[PDB]
Amino acid sequence: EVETFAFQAEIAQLMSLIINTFYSNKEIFLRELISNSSDALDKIRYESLTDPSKLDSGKELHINLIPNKQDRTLTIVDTGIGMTKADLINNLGTIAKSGTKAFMEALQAGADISMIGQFGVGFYSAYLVAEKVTVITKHNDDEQYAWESSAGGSFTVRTDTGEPMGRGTKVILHLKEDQTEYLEERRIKEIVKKHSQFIGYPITLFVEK
Ligand SMILES: c1cnc(-c2cn[nH]c2)cn1
Incomplete structure (x- = not known):
């Protein structure tokens, strides 16, 4: 039983801009997704400070990076707070309408795409490197859900x-044919060291057979 939704017009515009704009510094997608994972881990940690049972679904707070060259997927797994079904539908827990508005005014006023995270819509930078994104998520207050989009407005x-x-969120990036460098160990290591050196959770880069 699959439900199909239309993106709000402003979010469809954001994804088309990310997909169509010539912009070489694509590697920032990983920084943005790791930062989202860190934010989600902060949230469940804060809730656990007054209610330890919030961690009954998993005590470990971490981020895993799982490349798979056979599937051509890069998966970012975190054990953060997760999202409810309502969160997924409502732009994956973001205020993406107002964030996109501010982001696009900034772009026409000097800014570049790498600053997308300052506007709360950094998730959508996944489409710099991915033709399709699948999001698997589990929040303590809801069931496990799968969100998916190949852009195109739905x-x-x-x-x-x-x-x-x-508990947590799994972002599966189905990479574009010419973006397979982000499945290589040394490339992922370089990006994590460059952009995510101060993330306060263990980031484990899985290796492949
Ligand atoms: C990218 C985008 N959103 C998330 C997230 C996880 N829990 N809540 C939001 C993770 N990575």
Whole structure:
């Protein structure tokens, strides 16, 4: 049972701009997704300070980077607070309408795409390198759901029957054919060292057989 939704016009405009603008510094997508994971881990940590049972779904707070050259996917896994179904539909827990508005005024006033995270819509930088993005998420107050979009103005939401997560979010980047450098160990290591050196959670880069 798959539900198909239309993006708000402003968000469709944001994704088309990310996809169509010539902009070589694509590597910032990873910084933005790791920063979102860190924000999500901060949220569940804060809730656990007054209610330890919030971590019954998983005590470990971490970020895993899982490249898969056979599937041509880069997966970013975190054990943060996760998102409800309502969060997923409402632009993955962002204020993307007003964030896009501010972002696009900044771009016409000197800014470049690498500053997207300052406007709260850094998730959509995934489409710098991915032709399709799948988001699997589990919030303590909801069931496990799968969000998916290949842009084109629509996204889908369905209950996820796959591997249970416990709690957190898994962003699966189905990479573009010419963006497979982000599956190489030394390239991922370089980007993490360059842009995410002060993230306060363990970031584990998985290796492949
Ligand atoms: C990218 C975008 N959003 C997230 C997230 C996780 N929990 N809540 C929001 C993670 N990575």
